[PDB]
Amino acid sequence: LTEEDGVHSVIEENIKCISRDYVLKQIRSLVQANPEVAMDSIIHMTQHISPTQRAEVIRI
Amino acid sequence: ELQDIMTSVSGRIPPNVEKSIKKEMAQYASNITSVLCQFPSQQIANILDSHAATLNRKSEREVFFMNTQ
Numbered sequence: 080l081t082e083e084d085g086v087h088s089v090i091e092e093n094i095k096c097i098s099r100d101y102v103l104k105q106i107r108s109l110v111q112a113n114p115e116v117a118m119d120s121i122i123h124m125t126q127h128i129s130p131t132q133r134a135e136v137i138r139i
Numbered sequence: 140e141l142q143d144i145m146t147s148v149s150g151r152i153p154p155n156v157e158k159s160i161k162k163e164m165a166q167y168a169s170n171i172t173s174v175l176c177q178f179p180s181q182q183i184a185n186i187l188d189s190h191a192a193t194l195n196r197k198s199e200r201e202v203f204f205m206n207t208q
Contacts, residue, residue, distance in 0.1 A: 122175035 151206045159186060 082088075110117060125132055141164060145157075160183050170176040187207060194200060 126175070 148206060151202055153190060156187060156190060159183070 145161065145164075163179060163183065167176065167178065191207070194203065
């Protein structure tokens with residue numbers, strides 16, 4: 080815990096990755112209960128990254 | 140129409156709640172003409188019901204109930 084607001088460890092980063100992973104799975108479950116909602120969830124989701132995000136979808 | 144009632148219910152009003160709703164209609168105005176604008180119905184209602192959470196112990200509520208109706 081010596082480096083606060085400094086060079087952080089990657090074990091910390093890894094733990095963050097699990098946190099990332101865990102939230103992600105929650106969403107997987109969430110969509111699983113209500114898959115129809117994605118699009119509307121997405122419109123808000125697109126509120127960010129959107130031009131690039133259009134690029135991959137348009138690719139698709 | 141929510142304007143028009145809210146023009147017609149300037150009274151009977153908790154101004155706090157009014158300031159909330161009138162803000163966020165204002166931000167219906169800000170987010171309109173987006174492809175993705177919806178009314179935050181559940182938010183305003185639930186908030187109001189925070190103030191049901193606070194008022195409801197009292198039966199003081201027949202003007203208020205019928206405005207919240």
